[PDB]
């Protein structure tokens, strides 16, 4: 929208010592012909040589039973698949044994390769970064003209895990190897498209694929352009000596359009050719797609700030309810009756439910960053909201229910937002006093379930078998209640004398 960063990010990557050091290691590994481990300027380099093979294009799922395991990438519903030949060569070279033991003590490790060696280096970096625990060193991968490794599910699983920025794939605009794999293969990690004049970074899988399509349809074809990677690295690494103006035409007065034009000319296409227009549209679309989630997260943060008085209202309602002389708890004060305070807490609860419904639906639709729920701010926000408001929602549900056809709350009647919040909280000692709020949010729903169960158990006195079975399903509820209260992980309103918990307790004990 305002600043073009695609060409800048590429310049940042090109200007580093990692660029030339990685290419030097790749050249040495290609010349020797085997895996090399090297130390330059305190950084360890694992250069994996280009290995000639016959088969490339067959996908196989990740191995769950083997020495090479991947705890990190097993969440994507379509099992993340990788190229079969790459994994077979990984096992054949015994990179695990020859690597995990030789890298002990190192603190910065860069893994790099040319052609097939690049796809292997990406695979090994993914293995190092995908273990159950983060490694003893930081891992960065740089590949040169590597063919695509896996399928779209694997790319999405990498991006969702925040591992895509540990990979940089330098690709020449004429190197046909990465542009020609089967359409089931998807890219991942930042791609650096370079030419004789400059480089441009793209970090979105869809935009990278569109760039591959554009290059396939327009640009020329050659094979030595894969052995020209040496010339490309050297030429790119020495542009800091040369002033590089926008040669040909006059830049648009706008800053963003001038940036886009400069990026397009860095890729080598003129701003007047069909290739140039296609590339310019691709770049603009990529920047827009990157920008949108950050804007949406900012807007949702503003909306969350605007909603805080509602949560404060619910906290005040709890305080006045458990500070009142009837001693019912705010659950019963909200479900039994309907007062002015109940009306206002209802308004606040409706606002909270609406806002969090919007937040959850935006999260699921993938309109927000993948690192959204991992952020501890939204973890706290969802946690406090759920703890304060879920019993109110349960009260509302059993207040507006049919006693029989309405069923119960957890059996398919629970809103999706609370389940997603359960996911978020799980994704991230005895208590001296009672907890401020009940730790088991669905406590009251289970209590209502057990109240119906005990009503049925007392409904019949001529069916001792049904009495016994209802007792079998009532005992784990009371055991769970005792475990919850002994740890004092429940708010004091659960122990109120006129709270529904107390009367149900008395009724069940007199029932025995």
């Amino acid at each position: 929208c305002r600043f073009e960063t695609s060409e800048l990010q590429a310049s940042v990557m090109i200007s580093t010592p990692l660029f030339t050091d990685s290419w030097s290691s790749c050249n040495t590994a290609n010349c020797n012909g085997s895996i090399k481990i090297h130390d330059i300027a305190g950084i360890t380099y694992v250069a994996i040589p280009a290995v000639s093979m016959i088969q490339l294009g067959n996908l196989v799922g990740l191995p769950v039973t083997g020495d090479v395991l991947f705890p990190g990438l097993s969440s994507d519903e379509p099992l993340p698949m990788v190229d079969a030949a790459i994994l077979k060569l990984f096992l054949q070279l015994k990179i695990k044994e020859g690597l995990e033991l030789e890298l002990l003590g190192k603190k910065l490790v860069v893994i790099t390769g040319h052609s097939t060696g690049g796809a292997l280096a990406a695979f090994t970096a993914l293995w190092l970064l995908s273990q159950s625990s983060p490694p003893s060193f930081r891992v960065f991968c740089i590949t040169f003209g590597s063919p695509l490794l896996g399928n779209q599910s694997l790319s999405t699983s990498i991006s969702r895990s925040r591992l895509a920025h540990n990979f940089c794939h330098v690709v020449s605009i004429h190197d046909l190897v990465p542009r020609s794999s089967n359409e089931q293969f998807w890219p991942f990690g930042t791609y650096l498209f370079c030419s004789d004049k400059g480089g441009v970074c793209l970090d979105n899988a869809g935009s990278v694929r569109l760039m591959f399509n554009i290059l396939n349809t327009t640009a020329t074809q050659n094979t030595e352009e894969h052995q020209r990677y040496g010339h490309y690295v050297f030429t790119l690494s020495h542009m800091f000596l040369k002033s590089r103006s926008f040669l040909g035409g006059s830049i648009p007065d706008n800053s963003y359009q001038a940036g886009v034009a400069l990026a397009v000319e860095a890729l080598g296409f003129s701003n007047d050719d069909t290739s140039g227009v296609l590339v310019k549209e691709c770049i603009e679309t990529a920047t827009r797609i990157v920008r949108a989630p950050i804007l949406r997260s900012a807007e949702l943060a503003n909306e969350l700030a605007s909603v805080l008085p509602a949560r404060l209202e619910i906290q005040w309602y709890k305080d006045r309810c458990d500070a009142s002389e009837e001693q019912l708890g705010y659950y019963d004060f909200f479900k039994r009756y309907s007062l002015k305070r109940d009306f206002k807490v209802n308004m606040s609860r409706i606002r909270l439910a609406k806002f969090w419904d919007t937040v959850i639906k935006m999260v699921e639709t993938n309109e927000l960053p993948f690192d959204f729920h991992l952020g501890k701010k939204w973890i706290y926000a969802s946690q406090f909201y759920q703890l304060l408001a879920e019993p109110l929602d349960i009260a509302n549900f059993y207040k507006n229910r049919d006693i029989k056809t309405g069923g119960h709350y957890l059996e398919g009647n629970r809103p999706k937002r609370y389940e997603v919040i359960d996911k978020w909280q799980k994704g991230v000692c005895v208590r001296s006093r009672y907890a401020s709020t009940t730790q088991d949010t669905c406590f009251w729903a289970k209590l209502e379930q057990a109240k119906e169960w005990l009503d049925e158990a007392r409904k019949e006195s001529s069916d001792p078998q049904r009495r016994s079975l209802l007792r079998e399903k009532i005992v784990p509820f009371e055991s769970y209640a005792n475990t919850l209260v002994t740890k004092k992980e429940v708010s004091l309103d659960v122990k109120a004398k006129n709270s529904s918990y107390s009367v149900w307790e008395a009724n069940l004990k007199e029932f025995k």
Binding site: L8, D203, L241
Partner: protein, 611 residues
């Protein structure tokens, strides 16, 4: 001319500064020159790698953190991070300062004569000059700021001295207008400290000896220096626009980048133009992009000109009069200026990005001022002062206790206003941390007054909130892990504002006062017991009280005596209200009347509470 208006130095002072820097080659460590009402302290340049990189400094840039007692102001006021400078230059300055020389006595004698103090320098002497000026500013100007005591600093091709915190501290105190660093377009010395030590270890001595008044060595040195300069400039511009956060964060562990940044006004000089720049990031980008080669012929010529331009300042100061001057940050059409200075279109984009980020900072400050001016916002503070506090002290318990215990509709709306104000101030804090506000925002008088008012008014409410929800039973003491960052920031800004004229650090003043209390325990265990104590800030009074009301007396005797000692000055300053804490229903009074009658007698607060 416009140059004199913008910078405050005329051609006469510049010529005299250049002459003094010339004669500084001979004299040892400095040279004082008299001319009318102007005394100039030129500094001797040095051309040995031991004088640019410190041999005993095991860092790859030769940098070291300033001591927050010798240069107390050079830091982040809210964050607390001290500035960083080249160690060799600092050691040279400290050798020049030492009482075994006549530098300090001469400086005092010149200050007493109402003279205009000018520190000037060439090459390494220019770096020392910069440091000397800061020394002067930390020692004389901040102590009694007058127009006469305003120094001037004129450097000629001087290397970079400090990091970004150095420049930020210069800009916050409004001292950056004093410094003027003439740079000729191709001079390698202003860009040398942007390289790593290892990149130039092998070639530095030869080039340095060539700078003192093999082509392979000169070319290799220039290439390595400009390579590291390109890396630093690219990373800097990519970071200040917020571009590629995660990519930069992952490379940062693999990148070893120079911290030095321009400080003060720079003046880039050509054969026909004279461009003044005040934006440190714009100067960094210009440093990279004004010395790239247009074509192969000029590329062959650059390594020569990069050294012969280090001796072009004679002609610069002689011909300054007949050069077309312009101000980069002022004018809006920066295209013609930068094109004449040899910047390319991409370099122009990045310089423009730096300037526009500065303008974004200014507009963010305008938005913040407009928000804190809105009556809707002011009404919250007014309501807490005028309706909440008098009613809660009419109930004979104080608003702290009323907020913490009672559930009045008034308490609820006080909680709501507390939350909304905390939102506004956390937003401003988030802008500060991202470096999105101008440098002197932490030094603004209106912001300091308003933030101090908000802290004194509302921090007791935040402590009451922290203890009403029982955080101290799980999250630990409030002063250790529960205190909001914005409150520390506001406290630090106010403390700096009041104590900086006396040249003292707030914690040092606190330690002096507690030593003056003459406790029954010596230095080590009093310093050990006053760790994370709530007696270092007045607005945290109640926090400390909640740490003392549950403990036996003999464990907290020193803490209680410290609280007693601080209360009088806290009440006098208005940090702690006296109508609130001494009421019958107040928590403080109820806990205090439980203290032993011996302490109750010998405490300085008999006259306030009865049993």
């Amino acid at each position: 001319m416009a140059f004199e208006a913008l910078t405050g130095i005329n051609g006469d002072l510049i010529t005299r500064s250049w002459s003094a820097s010339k004669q500084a080659y001979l004299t040892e460590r400095y040279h004082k020159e008299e001319a009318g009402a102007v005394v100039i302290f030129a500094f001797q340049p040095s051309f040995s790698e031991k004088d640019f990189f410190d041999p005993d400094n095991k860092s790859s840039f030769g940098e070291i953190k300033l001591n927050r007692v010798q240069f107390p102001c050079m830091r982040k006021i809210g964050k607390g991070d001290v500035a960083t400078v080249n160690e060799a230059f600092l050691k040279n300055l400290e050798a020049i300062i030492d009482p075994r020389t006549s530098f300090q006595a001469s400086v005092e004698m010149a200050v007493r004569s109402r003279k205009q103090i000018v520190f000037t320098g060439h090459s390494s002497g220019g770096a020392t000059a910069i440091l000397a000026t800061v020394w002067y500013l930390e020692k004389y100007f901040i102590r009694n700021p007058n127009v006469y005591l305003e120094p001037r600093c004129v450097t000629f091709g001087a290397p970079l001295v400090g990091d970004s915190i150095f420049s930020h501290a210069l800009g916050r105190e409004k001292w950056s207008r004093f410094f003027v660093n003439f740079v000729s377009r191709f001079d390698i010395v202003p860009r040398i400290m942007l390289a790593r030590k290892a990149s130039v270890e092998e070639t530095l001595p030869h080039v340095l000896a060539q700078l003192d008044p093999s082509e392979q060595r000169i070319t290799e040195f220039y290439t390595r220096v400009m390579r590291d300069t390109s890396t630093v400039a690219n990373q800097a511009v990519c970071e200040l626009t917020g571009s590629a956060e995660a990519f930069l964060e992952t490379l940062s562990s693999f990148l070893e980048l120079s911290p030095y940044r321009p400080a003060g006004t720079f003046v880039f000089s050509t054969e026909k133009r004279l461009v003044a720049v005040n934006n440190s990031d714009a100067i960094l980008q210009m440093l990279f992009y004004t010395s790239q080669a247009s074509d192969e012929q000029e590329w062959s010529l650059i390594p020569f000109r990069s050294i012969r331009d280090h001796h072009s300042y004679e002609e610069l100061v002689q011909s300054m009069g007949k050069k077309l001057f312009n101000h980069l940050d002022g004018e809006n059409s920066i295209e013609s200026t930068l094109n004449d200075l040899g910047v390319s279109t991409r370099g122009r984009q990045y310089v423009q990005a730096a300037l526009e980020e500065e303008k974004k900072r200014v507009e963010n400050q305008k938005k913040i001022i407009q928000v804190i001016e809105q009556e809707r916002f002011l009404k919250k503070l007014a309501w807490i002062e005028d309706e909440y506090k008098p009613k809660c002290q009419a109930h004979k318990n104080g608003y702290y206790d009323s907020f913490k215990v009672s559930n009045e509709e008034n308490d609820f709306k006080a909680n709501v206003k507390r939350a909304e104000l905390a939102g506004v101030f956390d937003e401003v804090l988030g802008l500060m941390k991202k470096c999105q506000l101008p440098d002197e925002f932490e030094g603004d008088i209106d912001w300091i007054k308003l933030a101090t008012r908000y802290r004194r008014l509302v921090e007791p409410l935040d402590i009451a909130n922290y203890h009403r929800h029982l955080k101290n039973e799980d999250t630990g003491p409030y002063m250790k892990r529960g205190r909001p960052t914005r409150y520390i920031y506001a406290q630090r800004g106010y403390e700096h504002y009041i104590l900086k004229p006396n040249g003292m650090i707030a914690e040092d003043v606190f330690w002096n006062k507690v030593n003056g209390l003459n406790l029954g325990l010596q230095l080590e265990e009093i310093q050990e017991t006053l760790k994370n104590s709530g007696s270092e800030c007045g607005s945290c009074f109640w926090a400390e009280v909640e740490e003392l009301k549950g403990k036996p007396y003999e464990e907290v005797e020193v803490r209680v005596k410290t609280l007693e000692g601080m209360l009088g000055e806290w009440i006098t300053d208005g940090e702690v209200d006296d109508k609130e804490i001494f009421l019958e229903g107040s928590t403080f009074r109820k806990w205090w009347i439980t203290l032993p009658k011996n302490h109750k007698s010998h405490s300085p607060l008999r006259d306030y509470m009865m049993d």
